[model samples]
Target chain A: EPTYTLYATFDNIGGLKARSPVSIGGVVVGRVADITLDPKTYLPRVTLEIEQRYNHIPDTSSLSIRTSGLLGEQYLALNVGFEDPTAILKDGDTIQDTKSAMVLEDLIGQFLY
Target chain B: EPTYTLYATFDNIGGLKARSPVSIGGVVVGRVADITLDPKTYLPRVTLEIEQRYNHIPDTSSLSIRTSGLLGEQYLALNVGFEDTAILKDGDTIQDTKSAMVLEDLIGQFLY
Candidate 1:
């Protein structure tokens, strides 16, 4: 019955931009603001805002940076939790242990093999 | 009331698609741009342009792409509205529904 806010800083964008669909669980949710390189930290700082109703998103909730298809575009993807739906995360919390998807060139090599 | 854009595509999709965060009960409003294949890898490419009017997404709107817990890529998610104000428009940026995890590789993703 509770929700919260979240934020983070990303790196190695490779000149990609925009959160096209702003989806939720594969469905349209909201679009992304501007993705820029923070001069001080040398990282791509992504700023966004969600609803307070979903603030109760479990503490173990996770997210993924994904693209539409092989060699397509890049955007933010979400993955919420189930076991402890009541668990909520606090603000300014760093969501460590995340992974970015592979580019088309890399996949091509794997496909050939 | 603001909005923006981004793009992404998915590879090795394993036949799964779409974002599940459209709760509906809250009855948020908007539209998705398009979803196609990423010719090179034959994967699906999803594109979207959100509205500018109803943009104030919340801060905790995390997102995920799951297909019953073992296989699925990723998707953008959003959470907006504190007490309901108005509807959103086209070509605007939506903030919430950001991601922080990755399940597979070479999956479709997009940016606005």
Candidate 2:
């Protein structure tokens, strides 16, 4: 199995409070290893490992931060590659354009206002 | 063993194709079952079955259409449940959601 590793640097120190839910396509398969601040940069970094068998992830694949439920802890969700025209993402790739899950407290605060 | 079934309605006939790689946190576990047109409506419907062992899918779990390789077939993929405040569901084997994947369309339209 040719496993691949991906590293993401997040903007805020409010790192993943909980574990990330790994999904191939959508099924959960693996997990996020750890969350810590980069010693040199001080930015929050997340280290994740996926099974080696899934070595053909397309370059178009995406990663996102999500929550289990309302007022729930934060976790990462991965979007498996899509074939339509079949795009492939290389190993040790960085999904820089990835998006973050909506912050529930922030949304609720709007309602209160 | 306890197994849950999810029911999804796809808007277009372009449902999941080939094999939608099943993943846990971010790994592939299973494959999409099949993609066929609804007899009465003529729309596309996909039937997917996951490992009974992975029986912890949450209600928020979303399913999408994806492909294996370039210009490959389409298939349905499953998302695992995230446990934040620890929520669970009680019912038959079915999670209902309305979502679909659009890859080919965009490739043709924008990314030429």
Candidate 3:
């Protein structure tokens, strides 16, 4: 299958970069193309390019940013869920459901306290 | 198995809020994900992501898909917010300063 494009948005990417991995259970299936702020929504828009082999991912599937390893590299993670049987995602479509990056800084004070 | 971005919803997500857990038998394998509204229909909508392990769930013995989303709330808030900022600023700060010049689509833009 050919590679496909998808979009994801978040309030915080937590250090996510243009070339970060888009993984399925830690297995890299794709990479983020670039990041731009939605001029209207004022949220970050991420372009995701995934392998066609992984295209079966349904529109009902979801995404979240996850940190990997002792070093702080953050990656986009996917999850499977229920919906219509023909609900697989398509190109140029936005994956409307997502999780904001866990800004550890938000809890840094609690850690020290 | 990998995780999935799913469609889940409510008339209210005030509690099923984002970052909330996507559980299976109370075992959290994913998160509640993003919340939005169905602009065309005027209802609350949500985008959920659950772990790939949770794929065992049927494509639909239950829920369905392809219902569009965002806000009214979405349209009203996002529609002209960007345009309003720059113009409103220059207008208020300079309406008494300049004629507030901009004609690109200003006329037709208002028709929308």
What TM-score fits each model? 0.38, 0.40, 0.48
Which scores better on DockQ, 1 or 2? 1
Off by over 4 Å in 2: A12-19, A71-73, A81-87, B1-112
- C-alpha positional error of residue A13 in candidate 2 after TM-score superposition, expressed in Å: 7.3
Candidate 2's residue-wise lDDT over B1-104, tens digit each? 34333345566636355455443323343554556777898766655555555555556666544433334344444544455523223333324433443556
Q: Quality of candidate 2's docking, in CAPRI categories?
A: incorrect
lDDT of 3 by residue, A1-113 (tens): 36789998776664577898899878999899887655444457889999888767877778898777645577899776676733778788878789976533234325444
RMSD of 2: 16.4
Candidates 1 onward: DockQ, in order = 0.02, 0.01, 0.02
For model 1, how does the per-residue alpha-carbon lDDT over B16-112 read when each residue is reduced to its tens digit? Answer: 3443222111112232345567768775554454444334443333222222122333333333345344333443333333222332432433221
lDDT (CA) for every model shown?
Answer: 0.42, 0.52, 0.54
**Candidate 3 runs further than 4 Å off:** A83-86, A110-113, B1-112
TM-score of 2: 0.40
The most accurate candidate by DockQ is 1
TM-score: the better of candidates 2 and 3: 3
Per-residue lDDT for B1-112 in model 3, tens only?
Answer: 3556656434433334466553221123455466678878665665556554433333222221110121101100011122323332111111111011123444455455
Per-residue CA lDDT of candidate 1, range A1-48, in tens? Answer: 232335545544332355443346777444444555443333455544
